[PDB]
Enzyme design. Structure first.
Site, PDB file in Angstrom:
ATOM      1  N   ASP A  30      -0.590   7.218  -2.592  1.00  0.00           N
ATOM      2  CA  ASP A  30      -0.744   5.913  -1.964  1.00  0.00           C
ATOM      3  C   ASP A  30      -1.850   6.059  -0.914  1.00  0.00           C
ATOM      4  O   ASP A  30      -2.393   7.150  -0.733  1.00  0.00           O
ATOM      5  CB  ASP A  30       0.620   5.455  -1.394  1.00  0.00           C
ATOM      6  CG  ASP A  30       0.711   3.916  -1.176  1.00  0.00           C
ATOM      7  OD1 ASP A  30      -0.294   3.180  -1.167  1.00  0.00           O
ATOM      8  OD2 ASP A  30       1.835   3.394  -1.090  1.00  0.00           O
ATOM      9  N   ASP A  54      -5.318  -0.152  -1.749  1.00  0.00           N
ATOM     10  CA  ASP A  54      -3.870  -0.010  -1.730  1.00  0.00           C
ATOM     11  C   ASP A  54      -3.294  -0.875  -2.861  1.00  0.00           C
ATOM     12  O   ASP A  54      -3.218  -2.110  -2.722  1.00  0.00           O
ATOM     13  CB  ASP A  54      -3.358  -0.525  -0.380  1.00  0.00           C
ATOM     14  CG  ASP A  54      -1.887  -0.295  -0.180  1.00  0.00           C
ATOM     15  OD1 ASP A  54      -1.214   0.340  -1.037  1.00  0.00           O
ATOM     16  OD2 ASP A  54      -1.414  -0.657   0.938  1.00  0.00           O
ATOM     17  N   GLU A  91       5.984  -2.558  -4.885  1.00  0.00           N
ATOM     18  CA  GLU A  91       6.091  -1.661  -3.741  1.00  0.00           C
ATOM     19  C   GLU A  91       5.936  -2.431  -2.431  1.00  0.00           C
ATOM     20  O   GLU A  91       6.590  -2.090  -1.412  1.00  0.00           O
ATOM     21  CB  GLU A  91       5.005  -0.585  -3.831  1.00  0.00           C
ATOM     22  CG  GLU A  91       5.128   0.532  -2.692  1.00  0.00           C
ATOM     23  CD  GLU A  91       4.484   0.178  -1.345  1.00  0.00           C
ATOM     24  OE1 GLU A  91       3.688  -0.776  -1.243  1.00  0.00           O
ATOM     25  OE2 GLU A  91       4.779   0.922  -0.383  1.00  0.00           O
TER      26      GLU A  91
HETATM   27 CO   LIG Z   1       0.310  -1.982   1.155  1.00  0.00          CO
HETATM   28  O   LIG Z   2       1.445   0.515   0.637  1.00  0.00           O
HETATM   29 ZN   LIG Z   3       0.485   1.281  -1.011  1.00  0.00          ZN
END
Ligand SMILES: [Co+2]
Ligand SMILES: [O-]
Ligand SMILES: [Zn+2]
Ligand SMILES: [Co+2]
Ligand SMILES: [Co+2]
Ligand SMILES: [Zn+2]
Ligand SMILES: [Zn+2]
Lengths: 331, 331, 331
Positions: free
Chosen positions: A220, A168, A197
């Site tokens: 994502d 991630d 983010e």
């Molecule tokens: Co994250």
């Molecule tokens: O995320």
């Molecule tokens: Zn992410």
């Protein structure tokens, strides 16, 4: 794509300090883009092609991490999370700081009973970092208040799965890099490698402002709920293909974009799965809320152990996602 | 107005899937608007008139609902709320899905004790939907992951009150439609029938971007706290007239707009009441935050049992709200 | 049988006020019975045939419901359950009263915290009904203390299952009606449509007194424990056939009667299943305790969601139960 994932996931880039990751992505993309720019917050915006339809592909370049909040008289550091890091994932772990310092995470507890109580309700107030300093002055020269760090953890192949920190969203970054390496676009393709983010979708809430996009697809991670006693209401699993996000807590994907992608996957025999996520959000929210509204969707990589130092993906899901986007966007 | 309210409240339109409602509103407005457009998120924007002052009236076209998140080997479905649906409003209830399927909501519990524990702390993890399928493959063909649903509930008159699902905010849609049907505007009147209010004010956070408004007024429901042991800090009640919202948790209304409306109400002998709401929000927040800031207020319809399948309004409040807006905005 | 089930399940007949259901049954039976009587409590007793063995088939005509216990100064009602209605099945639901009034069920709670406390330990003391009245005098004219009501819910087919209120026990009433319509009886067949089963087996505790029966078979619903995390110690399921009740908390069926029915089911290839129920009771107890004791059993229709407004049965189980009884009692 293995070495690209190794390099991106091991690079240093907690929210707000993503420079090193940004420069690696640019080096991988040179020769495969027509131009790029970096905006005032640090978002990297690249483009290829000149088709009439304009599409953004977005992945965030930040990872969760920590920042030093205080230093005591013996040289120990106190920290604050950067994004959603659980203190349980830090116990006994090492942290790598931006300047290369390694620190060991320890927990307070003046009696064995206190230690039991603290781990029952663990908080960042009970953690500290030891960087080997012997005084406050020594620690302030080494790793002062405001220093950022990430998990001291790297990439390993585990019987065909890939494991690292910061899948991630370095896995989404790798997807988009590979798309630009391979695609002959039928669209004007914008790649947005966005900042911050994990601290509130900050980068993607502005990166689309100056991009004339007709559509935006965020890439994502999502929860691969195929471990023992995983989240029962999540259907996503490893090797089920790209996960087409119907909804999470930050956005509902454009129905038309999801239908387009389903049509592409069926036409070209790409395995895919539908996603509803009961917590969490992605940068698709930032593009939906830009200017008069950019229709947006998310395509997710199923990931086990999200926000741990050992996030795990299946490489066939990543290759299928690349294929899906190339077939949707390429000439 | 009764048949308009019956049609709008019974239509299918959970957040993200509001097409059916949008199409009914456009049909009702034929012959009463000067033009319209639909933006990329699905917001419907209509206009009438050409005065120097430009005013938005907004109502949201989405209602709360559910989405299918998983399917088990025996064909039962699990769901996630779309907007603020309480699991207590779903027990023993039926759900109508977009494709017309009816499902029955049931609760888990392998012993009588577990069933008692589960209802004490009910969560969506303990609910399932039965659509009559006998296997996973049958259910996937019928109502797969990502299928949206609403309460299986419709409109009835209850001794002069009106009761239906989705008074929030089909009653506000009806108010605005009736204003357009009747008004000779002295302003340039924009009507915005916005999407995805219940999942974070999404539609109204962008619908104003391309509208040159001087003011925006959201029409939405508020808590009619006139039932037994109702919320004691809410003053609003049925038949007290349109409620002028001073503040809720998402916005403070423009003082100037509220004063303008009070002047109109006093000049034309329209009953009204003031509102302070201790939870909740409306689309006024989206218009306030648009571009350089659009001065915004909310005028609310007092509603009992909000977010249940049996929301209740007093038609005289609805008629007074239409009167107030026509007097304020019309020639 | 579908239209008969639709009509019986939708009819109004809470315990103590079953007249409309009794009248429908008597009309359906015209031409198929030799005589009938209605006793002082309201039980309907019919008969056909002349054989030496006299057998009662019983189903109860009452359903669970509510009764108004008080009225407040603003016209809201408070209620008491009639039979085993859970307050959790009433939240946000509508009630249909004997005189046709519709009321909406709401919950007390003067703060958001009180509302959360109240739903965690819900009781009828925290519920009220809104019938649209604006004063005590108006409500007393509309729906005074002592008015009975039932769920406002009706019949729907759900992919081949039937769903309605009051499958308990209008499905048993439908079974016995269909037996009388089709059978050429080898016994003297008595049909008892008993009242007030849900408030203590009242009707069937006396309906056998004046009937010279050698056997009594109650037809009632049982728990179809084939939903997610259903009651683990119940084996009964939809489409497993009539359930032959070995025991529940009110009776142990006659072993000889169960053996007779098993022999019939094996001889005529009728699917059946055995039942042990860990809570609940049926009218078999009333016949067992009549006079010097009538040997009694229960044959049950597997039903999901018992005592909800959406009870669910499998029509094949109902057909098989009719077949079983005709084979056992007919020429
Ligand atoms: Co994250
Ligand atoms: O995320
Ligand atoms: Zn992410
Ligand atoms: Co709402
Ligand atoms: Co019962
Ligand atoms: Zn609303
Ligand atoms: Zn019963």
């Amino acid at each position: 794509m293995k070495e690209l994932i190794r390099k991106l996931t091991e690079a240093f880039g907690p929210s707000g300090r993503e420079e090193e990751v940004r420069s690696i992505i640019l080096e991988e993309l040179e020769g495969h883009i027509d131009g790029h720019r970096i905006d005032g917050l640090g978002n990297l915006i690249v483009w290829k092609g000149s088709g009439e339809k304009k599409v953004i592909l977005d992945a965030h370049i930040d990872e969760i991490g920590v920042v030093v909040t205080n230093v005591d008289d013996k040289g120990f550091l106190t920290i604050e999370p950067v994004g959603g890091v659980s203190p349980y994932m830090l116990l006994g772990k090492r942290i790598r700081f931006e300047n290369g310092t390694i620190g060991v995470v320890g927990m307070e507890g003046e009696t064995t009973e206190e230690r039991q109580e603290n781990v029952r309700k663990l908080s960042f107030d009970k953690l500290f970092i030891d960087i080997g300093a012997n005084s406050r002055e020594e620690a302030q020269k080494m790793c002062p208040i405001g220093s950022f760090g990430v998990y001291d953890s790297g990439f390993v192949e585990v019987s065909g799965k890939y494991v690292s920190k910061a899948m991630d969203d370095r896995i989404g970054c790798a997807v988009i890099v590979e798309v630009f390496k391979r695609i002959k676009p039928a669209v004007t393709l914008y790649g947005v490698f966005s900042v911050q983010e994990e601290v509130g979708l900050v980068g993607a809430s502005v990166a689309g402002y100056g991009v004339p996009a007709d559509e935006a697809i965020a890439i994502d991670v999502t929860d691969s709920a195929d471990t023992p006693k995983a989240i029962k209401r999540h259907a996503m699993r490893l090797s089920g293909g790209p996960a087409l996000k119907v909804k999470d807590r930050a956005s509902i994907s454009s129905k038309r974009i999801l239908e387009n992608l389903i049509e592409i996957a069926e036409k070209f025999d790409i395995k895919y799965q539908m996603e509803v996520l009961t917590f969490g959000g992605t940068n698709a929210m930032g593009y939906q809320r830009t200017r008069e509204g950019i229709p947006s969707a998310t395509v997710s990589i199923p990931t086990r152990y999200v926000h741990s130092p050992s996030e795990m993906i299946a490489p066939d899901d990543v290759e299928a996602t690349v294929d899906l986007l190339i077939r949707y966007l390429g000439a």
